[PDB]
Design a protein around this ligand. Structure first.
Ligand SMILES: Nc1nc2c(ncn2[C@@H]2O[C@H](COP(=O)(O)OP(=O)(O)OP(=O)(O)O)[C@@H](O)[C@H]2O)c(=O)[nH]1
Ligand SMILES: Nc1nc2c(ncn2[C@@H]2O[C@H](COP(=O)(O)OP(=O)(O)OP(=O)(O)O)[C@@H](O)[C@H]2O)c(=O)[nH]1
Ligand SMILES: [Mg+2]
Ligand SMILES: [Mg+2]
Lengths: 50, 171, 50, 171
């Protein structure tokens, strides 16, 4: 009924917001890992030059 | 001033970081994480009177942490050390894949390559029989060395292994 | 409305599971961030010697 | 070759990386990302005939990416450069917070501190009036410099700023 409907609707909103926060965190992980790769790649090229 | 590049290839969690750290730092690393990209470790030695800088490359074993670095590994390589976990048959069965990767990136089939089985101190959990790994080592014309990064106790001490490979390279 | 009631419950269950995955992902974020700081801190100490 | 440490503090996305890269690389960076920890850039200069190595530290502005590095910033620091975004009043109001961070980490008032407003090329979106930032700069006894990493047309070019700071440091 009414009261069940709005309860679920509010939970749906929190569910969506919570997903977005997981998306941001996964984005930030990919940023960190890929940036680390750029670091070690440059260092690798420096050493292979010698 | 000669620098010899020695790469360390193998699956994840086999002990590449612990072996390279054992040779350069002389001690077993206590708290270890997944290697991201490469970990460069260098050690100077005097072989036959000549001073030589051994540069070990602790490559990654996780595909998410090594997909972009593969060809950086195989440039001006002087020696390749394959590592498998003696307590993990799956890491042993992955060696043909690494040998193929080594075939596809190398272009000289003479550089010294060695096979190393790690974690032999865990004698109660060894899964790769010595004869099987020895027969495989012979197939690809490599010496087999069963050792442990955490405790070389009267069994192919780590110092002897890398010194043997570097003593080969001076030639 | 009984169909709405169990439907709600399933979303709640999925919500809790999503929290667990976001916790692990946030853990991995801290894993990465702290490792970056370690590398940068050592570089700082090397430079602070001069 | 005496080395001078100059740290660059400010909020996130104000343009610290673009200013330091402009001074050291002599060109505007075509692409940047969020600085993690520190980002070290060095440039050799000739001040009054003496060769000096200016060591700019591009600190981070995001609290989660700098909370552990603060005391590495303020150790043996020779000069401090505070930066705000001229197109962001909120970054200007954050300057008292950064000055508090500086005072809490330094007990000596002998080192030069300067205040710099970036992104002055966006003349249509400037939000911080020159008089207000000057009045604040005067309060804490700092010189004010309004400039741009990209195009400071007749407006306090970046090299002139850091050369002035290094020239004052040599004395
Ligand atoms: N008992 C025993 N455990 C070892 C030995 N060497 C490594 N380990 C364990 O192996 C685990 C991780 O080994 P790593 O050296 O990180 O393996 P790795 O090749 O660096 O793994 P990746 O970096 O992900 O490729 C840790 O739990 C270590 O304690 C060893 O010689 N003996
Ligand atoms: N128009 C204009 N944009 C600028 C100027 N300087 C920097 N930017 C812009 O500022 C943005 C990012 O600036 P950053 O140098 O990365 O700022 P930051 O201080 O390093 O940021 P954090 O590392 O996160 O603390 C980019 O969009 C640049 O284009 C400038 O002089 N003029
Ligand atoms: Mg490793
Ligand atoms: Mg920056």
């Amino acid at each position: 009924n009414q009261t069940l409907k709005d309860e679920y609707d509010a939970l749906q909103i929190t569910f969506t917001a919570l997903e977005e926060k997981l998306r941001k965190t996964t984005e930030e992980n990919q940023e960190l890992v890929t940036r680390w790769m750029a670091e070690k790649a440059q260092e690798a090229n420096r050493l292979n030059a010698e | 001033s000669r620098i010899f590049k020695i790469i360390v290839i193998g699956d994840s969690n086999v002990g590449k970081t612990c072996l390279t750290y054992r040779f350069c730092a002389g001690r077993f690393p206590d708290r270890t994480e997944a290697t991201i990209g490469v970990d460069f470790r260098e050690r100077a030695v005097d072989i036959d009177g000549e001073r030589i800088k051994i540069q070990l490359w602790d490559t990654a074993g996780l595909e998410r942490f090594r997909k972009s670095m593969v060809q950086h590994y195989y440039r001006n390589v002087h020696a390749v050390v394959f590592v498998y976990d003696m307590t993990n048959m799956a890491s042993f069965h992955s060696l043909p894949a690494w040998i193929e990767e080594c075939k596809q990136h190398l272009l000289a089939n003479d550089i010294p390559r060695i096979l190393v089985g790690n974690k032999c101190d865990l004698r109660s959990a060894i899964q790769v029989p010595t004869d099987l790994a020895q027969k495989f080592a012979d197939t690809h014309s490599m010496p087999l060395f069963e050792t442990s990064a955490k405790n070389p106790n009267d069994n192919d001490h780590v110092e002897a292994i890398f010194m043997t490979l570097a003593h080969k390279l001076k030639s």
